[PDB]
């Protein structure tokens, strides 16, 4: 059928016609895979529950989502540790179907450096969580902790 | 930087994370936005870029977007005894176009469809006040699907 | 051991003996993978929640099941659209662990034709749902919508 | 007609469905039904096809079934000093059979087992009023497993 | 760098130095994959609900876990059947998201032998369960039933 | 003995189990236990095996453990103007060792690290009353990671 | 080209027969005949060949038979404390044998079995009046399976 | 070496031009010109070539044109009960043709289309006064697409 | 054939020794000896070889030693504002050297390190009274590691 006509082709500098056909399947409000960096405050000796509602905010463009499937969690000490000590952080995953008892701990080897640790959620436990829910318990000698949660907004 | 999929893992597994990586809380996003614009008979309508920024598309947190290509479809029936048709005239801040990319329907009961691509060199940002393209048609509304890149 | 005896062999027209052994593991009430076509009524501008209890009925032979793992959902406009308009349908999946916000929309390109759309549930979200639960919200300019839900009865 | 498995998808994904397919709300079903029938000493019992239709097997919504093959096992101990045994005589509407497929136990503490296949040419439907096969045995009950096709 | 020094090498009979580096990521309370054999009592004609709390006990070393992801379930008749009968056992899986209706039955071919049966949980249904929850309903002519549950403690 | 993974199964599936297998309700367990021990200046401390048995490590149900290898790290800052250091002296019931596996830090702001392996021939059990190794250091505490096998 | 059978017909076709063939309304027939015989403790029982001519076996229309092999199993439990056993002494019209082919059960609850082949050169017909073999055993009944040629 | 364009520049470079070339401010141009023409029922309409010279097409600066091919579609619905149809009779200054290249729609709601190629040896210029072809049809309007060479 | 060791023994075996060999109760020994030496600011310290003969190193039974290489690290923090540094001037009984092999830390919190090899032809014994090298540095203490041959 005289193969192709159109205008120019590939390496071009002008508008070119698109020979559309049938109206396609669309979606104005799709899903989105994201890594949300945010900080949380932590006292000494007390485990802070990281709420899922912190992922939902306009500071991440996600204030339009009402549910999230968490995949992995990573956390860095945000501040310096007490005098003479090396930073440290722990993570206990929490699941609406059953809270786990792990304390995935990572320590720093230099006092001036951040302590880092993180955990992966298996596929059979990636389920939606709402703002009211909590993702995990954080502990640390440091007063603030920076997280980077890899999750799927839908 | 040690993550896997397809694995047989049915429990949590520790990730040996190290240095705080480079992050971004407001990343960009390539989208194919759908929305409809009403039109009149024989009168052109300037589609304002400001319809791509809205909470109905999760984009009310953006102010500037790089349009890439437009595709238009008629949304309502055409006048009596007429076949549907729609025309697209690109519009750019640096100098409007005089093209009228027209597509007609070969069955009155069908939508008319057309689109145009914006070459790489003309892919600059546009804000809400700017325009995208003129849309003529004999059909009282028109449905668009604009592939773009929010930033 | 004189290989095989029996009667005839393969291309046969008479009863043939079966040299059974130990009573096997059985199951009088097994699982079943199905695609259940049913219609639902839809008003204009109002999202109708498709109840899971509609899959459970004797019209599908499934009135003997009390739970179902939904996999995918597909929907067609069952009636004609308003005057001058083209049919359209939307689907917002619902999950007991967290309702999603997608509006998977599919439109027709001919007024006389059905509009079609559908979505797939990932593996990590295939979990049982009971009659009381709902699968998704349907919207459309058409008054009835025909669905075909692929699911696993157990 | 675009569905996958094993995928790394952890969110819903749109399916580009088109024409309303061919459907069936009451499809067929191949089954291996288990049930037990009591028996007497030296007296044959005509297993009625109507035991395969019941809500205990999810089949009370069927009326006709294509039997394919029968397999029998004794369900209770045999008389004292005896070894278990069971006989199967096929029964068809078009003309009963005189076979007596017999299987015996070589250990008194074991079940006797036997079965028969129905060739393709004799695989017609049967309703509740019809019979399947005569079952003789010295054991007070008998357990069956009938591979069939409900329709 | 003069490749390796150390002491002896591989086939050795004395302590050897380990040239450690940075403090690693640790975990004092990890997960554990286990197969927990325990018995349950069963009446005649009555289905007994196997509680998840039976997996949590110091007799399995697991009295330190508060959640469990069940994978598969296997069960053997623990005692002899009534007079003149052959042992038998059934299993109906139970899920907090929706109880199933299967009756996976396995029978013995010798009266003096155990009847055995079991079922596998798909990946999409491996979710945590707490002590309060139940795994499945057991039936049998025998008064006791021995199970061996393959599960993942976390 | 018929179990699979990676399968497309989304419903329960029957397992054809047979004979009651060999079981064990209290199996063994290889572990890498972490804990910290305080230390003084110039004085050695005998790490008691009894710190590996505790509910904080899920091991309070064990009484005997086969140590395999020790690795030590300083847990607090060193004295002023000093670099961190730690020494490990293996201890065995059959005859203590006189080695002093020492590791120092090349940056005052860094931990000192060292470890030792126990050869196969010296891998016997140890109970709570036994000792593991002497730990010297200029740092007020020390953090250990003992690979072992509980039984 | 199809699913089942496929091209076959599926309706009748004509056969172009020729000359009238050779026929036989009363052919031979090779069988495995099952039947039991009572046995006294410490007495040998002469099995009659006329037990092979019976309508139970569809063979009441035969008067002769060519015996190939004799297999025997114990049919009832043995005396207390005793394991089952059975012996077979072959008998021929041309000269009786003296072998006592015996077999014993290793489990009191199991059948004792044995059998013997008759060689080609001893395979002649035997009428109802004849005897095939002598049976000795501690169980009262003994089941037999005889592969033979009815003619 | 990069992502988009890569090595290019990205800023201007100098061209080392030479002698002043041959130029043409007013070149030729090959086009596909779209336009409609009203048609009466049962009357043939002579299409004027001067419909190809218009600013709507950027061609008001041309006075001649070399026509290659003529394609026609029906633009309005047909009378009731009737299927659309259109006929094209070519016209040439050297001798008018007599072919009525016709086309019919198979669906009343669809356009009837047809067209004809003009061979090389009949491809001469045609001024506005000339005619290209006669159009007959049952629909009142008929849209045309003409591939031609403006010069 | 097994898991660990496997075939070995696992119990003692006999050795079929022969003539009485050549023995040496007091062999040589190659070592890396660690020890520190105090250093004054702006003064060179003569390291005595008699620091290599000590029971801390199991070498109190030696009287001579053949030095191969000398490596040095700073043991205490440098003055304020200053980066660590250390210099090594070799010394030999046949003629002292004049090289000041120096090394500097690039980070104030890090050790300054340097070392020098002694070539074969200068590797003779050295008694306790002798000196191995002169040390200069801004830190007060300086740790040494010397690869040498005790004999
Ligand atoms: Br271009
Ligand atoms: Br398109
Ligand atoms: Br599409
Ligand atoms: Br989508
Ligand atoms: Br991100
Ligand atoms: Br990241
Ligand atoms: Br605090
Ligand atoms: Br703490
Ligand atoms: Br702080
Ligand atoms: Br919580
Ligand atoms: Br603290
Ligand atoms: Br790696
Ligand atoms: Br696992
Ligand atoms: Br990382
Ligand atoms: Br990075
Ligand atoms: Br990344
Ligand atoms: Br980014
Ligand atoms: Br994107
Ligand atoms: Br999109
Ligand atoms: Br609107
Ligand atoms: Br118009
Ligand atoms: Br607007
Ligand atoms: Br610009
Ligand atoms: Br046959
Ligand atoms: Br079988
Ligand atoms: Br089986
Ligand atoms: Br099953
Ligand atoms: Br279906
Ligand atoms: Br389907
Ligand atoms: Br309505
Ligand atoms: Br609406
Ligand atoms: Br309607
Ligand atoms: Br809901
Ligand atoms: Br509406
Ligand atoms: Br495809
Ligand atoms: Br995903
Ligand atoms: Br489809
Ligand atoms: Br289809
Ligand atoms: Br299908
Ligand atoms: Br079907
Ligand atoms: Br089936
Ligand atoms: Br079945
Ligand atoms: Br019954
Ligand atoms: Br009987
Ligand atoms: Br009955
Ligand atoms: Br029939
Ligand atoms: Br060694
Ligand atoms: Br290490
Ligand atoms: Br690590
Ligand atoms: Br771990
Ligand atoms: Br285990
Ligand atoms: Br096991
Ligand atoms: Br009871
Ligand atoms: Br029961
Ligand atoms: Br009992
Ligand atoms: Br999964
Ligand atoms: Br329950
Ligand atoms: Br019972
Ligand atoms: Br296998
Ligand atoms: Br499945
Ligand atoms: Br098993
Ligand atoms: Br085993
Ligand atoms: Br195992
Ligand atoms: Br074990
Ligand atoms: Br282990
Ligand atoms: Br561990
Ligand atoms: Br402590
Ligand atoms: Br010290
Ligand atoms: Br202690
Ligand atoms: Br020992
Ligand atoms: Br023929
Ligand atoms: Br013939
Ligand atoms: Br014959
Ligand atoms: Br034959
Ligand atoms: Br036979
Ligand atoms: Br007797
Ligand atoms: Br006797
Ligand atoms: Br006797
Ligand atoms: Br007789
Ligand atoms: Br004789
Ligand atoms: Br012969
Ligand atoms: Br150039
Ligand atoms: Br030039
Ligand atoms: Br030119
Ligand atoms: Br051109
Ligand atoms: Br053109
Ligand atoms: Br007219
Ligand atoms: Br007309
Ligand atoms: Br006409
Ligand atoms: Br004109
Ligand atoms: Br003319
Ligand atoms: Br020409
Ligand atoms: Br030797
Ligand atoms: Br020797
Ligand atoms: Br020597
Ligand atoms: Br040596
Ligand atoms: Br050494
Ligand atoms: Br000084
Ligand atoms: Br100084
Ligand atoms: Br100096
Ligand atoms: Br000295
Ligand atoms: Br000298
Ligand atoms: Br030399
Ligand atoms: Ca938003
Ligand atoms: Ca039913
Ligand atoms: Ca414990
Ligand atoms: Mg570090
Ligand atoms: Mg339209
Ligand atoms: Mg369409
Ligand atoms: Mg029986
Ligand atoms: Mg058995
Ligand atoms: Mg330290
Ligand atoms: Mg017997
Ligand atoms: Mg027309
Ligand atoms: Mg220094």
Report on the architecture of this protein.
The structure is cut from a larger assembly and holds 9 copies of chain A. The first copy, chain A, has 154 residues and is mainly beta. The first copy, chain A, has one domain: Satellite virus coat domain (Jelly Rolls, Sandwich). In chain A, 0% of the residues lie in helices and 40% in strands. Chain A is built from no helices and 11 strands. In chain A, strands 3, 5, 8, 9 and 11 form a 5-stranded antiparallel beta sheet that branches. A 4-stranded antiparallel beta sheet of chain A has the order 4-10-6-7, with no helix packed on it. Chain A starts with 15 loop residues before the first strand and ends with a strand. Strand 8 (116-120) of chain C pairs antiparallel with strand 1 (13-15) of chain D, so a sheet runs across the interface. The structure holds bromide ion (103 copies), calcium ion (3 copies) and magnesium ion (9 copies). One bromide ion is lined by residues 1, 17-18 of chain B. Residues 27, 30 of chain A line the site of one bromide ion (BR). It is classed as virus. The entry lists the keywords virus. The entry is titled "Crystallographic structure of a cubic crystal form of STMV grown from bromide". Chains A and 8 copies: Coat protein. Organism of A, B, C, D, E, F: Satellite tobacco mosaic virus.
Give the secondary structure arrangement, pairings included.
This is part of a larger assembly, with nine copies of chain A.
Chain A: E1 16-18, E2 25-26, E3 32-41, E4 48-51, E5 68-77, E6 88-93, E7 105-107, E8 116-120, E9 128-129, E10 134-140, E11 144-153
Antiparallel strand pairs in A: 3-11, 4-10, 5-8, 5-9, 5-11, 6-7, 6-10
The structure holds bromide ion (103 copies), calcium ion (3 copies) and magnesium ion (MG) (9 copies).
PDB class: virus
Keywords: virus
Entry title: Crystallographic structure of a cubic crystal form of STMV grown from bromide
